[PDB]
Design brief:
This is part of a larger assembly, with two copies of chain A.
Chain A: H1 2-16, H2 55-70, E1 77-80, H3 89-102, E2 107-110, E3 123-125, E4 130-131, H4 139-143
Parallel strand pairs in A: 1-2
PDB class: cell cycle
Keywords: essential for the functional organization of genomes, cell cycle
Entry title: Condensin complex from S.cerevisiae ATP-free apo non-engaged state
Chain lengths: 144, 193
């Protein structure tokens, strides 16, 4: 199990975030069983952790870990909470590209936090609105 | 295990009166100027299942799930759902001859099994045809607001999440219970000897 999650962490971090892959390295001179950390990288440069990352690039590694956890029990339905504020629209379009080329079979939708965003997918639900729920006797002689 | 259509109603502060279709397996985005009509059916599923981790659904009375409980036009907690079983893997034994189903639930006294008065179990079947197992947070419902909670997580919780595929704590607790039981029962066996 730990071998599988370690070999999956690399490609999972490499595909979503371009040119930056990591490995489930133990924290401080130990084994993955009794301790494990992450060495987050900022694209081309190789840094120690995600503290130097932006909010969008932090939510990217967050959703990558979420997908790594969900891949054990897959489900064709994804929801993202409109976290494209710190990120860029082109980066979210590239994320959608990587989703449709890697996460085939997963309905991707967004909950409305900041209206007028996330037009990266082919089909999109428009705005038609009225009142209540969202929509587009001699024996002894012989013996003795 | 794919949703086909969602024509629901009966909620307070959102936007009814149309049906959504073409739920493709890959891409159905969300973009609009009014947030009241983008993704509120997820919020409807929140009160359908009753996820108590967020406060935007839990209140004093559950009657807030209806469209103003009747003082706005809709009194019955109406929800209509037509679900088709695209695959035969999510259909249990005895449900092969029922790929398509149409369930309506209310008249908020009792729910309707396909239009017959019955308890609130109907809504379960109303979401059963898309393998939406309401017991676990998995099975297409969501992972949820934990998106904003998993920040700054130490190594122990990550190891717990990785071992959640095996749940060694569960088997360890079961083995501890088995050990206590076997101790008591071996004492009983010594008494029997």
């Amino acid at each position: 199990t730990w071998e599988k999650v370690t070999l999956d962490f690399g490609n999972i971090f490499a595909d979503l975030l371009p040119n930056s892959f990591a490995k489930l390295v133990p924290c401080e001179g130990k084994d993955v069983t009794q301790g494990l950390e992450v060495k987050v990288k900022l694209g081309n440069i190789w840094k120690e952790s995600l503290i130097e990352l932006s909010g969008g690039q932090r939510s990217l590694i967050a959703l990558s870990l979420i997908m790594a956890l969900l891949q054990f029990r897959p489900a064709p339905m994804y929801i993202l909470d409109e976290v494209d504020a710190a990120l860029d629209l082109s980066h979210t379009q590239n994320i959608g590209h990587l989703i449709k080329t890697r996460f085939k079979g997963s309905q991707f939708i967004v909950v409305s936090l900041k209206e007028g965003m996330f037009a990266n997918a082919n089909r999109v639900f428009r705005t038609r609105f009225q009142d209540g729920t969202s929509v587009v006797x001699x024996x002894x002689x012989x013996x003795x | 295990m794919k949703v086909e259509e969602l024509i629901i109603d009966g909620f307070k502060s959102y936007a009814t009166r149309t049906v959504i279709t073409d739920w493709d397996p890959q891409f159905n985005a969300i973009t609009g100027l009014n947030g009241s009509g983008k993704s509120n059916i997820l919020d409807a599923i929140c009160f359908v299942l009753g996820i108590a981790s967020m406060s935007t659904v839990r209140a004093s009375s559950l009657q807030d799930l209806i469209y103003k409980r009747g003082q706005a036009g809709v009194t019955k907690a109406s929800v209509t759902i037509v679900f088709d079983n695209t695959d035969k893997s999510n259909s249990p034994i005895g449900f092969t001859n029922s790929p398509q189903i149409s369930v309506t639930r209310q008249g908020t006294s009792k729910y309707l099994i396909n239009g017959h008065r019955a308890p609130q179990q109907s809504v379960l079947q109303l979401f059963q045809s898309v393998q939406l197992n309401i017991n676990n947070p998995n099975f297409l419902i969501m992972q949820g607001k934990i998106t904003k909670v998993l920040n700054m997580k130490p190594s122990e919780i990550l190891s717990l999440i990785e071992e959640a595929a095996g749940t060694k704590m569960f088997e360890d607790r079961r083995e501890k219970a088995e050990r206590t039981m076997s101790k008591k029962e071996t004492k009983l066996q010594e008494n029997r000897t």
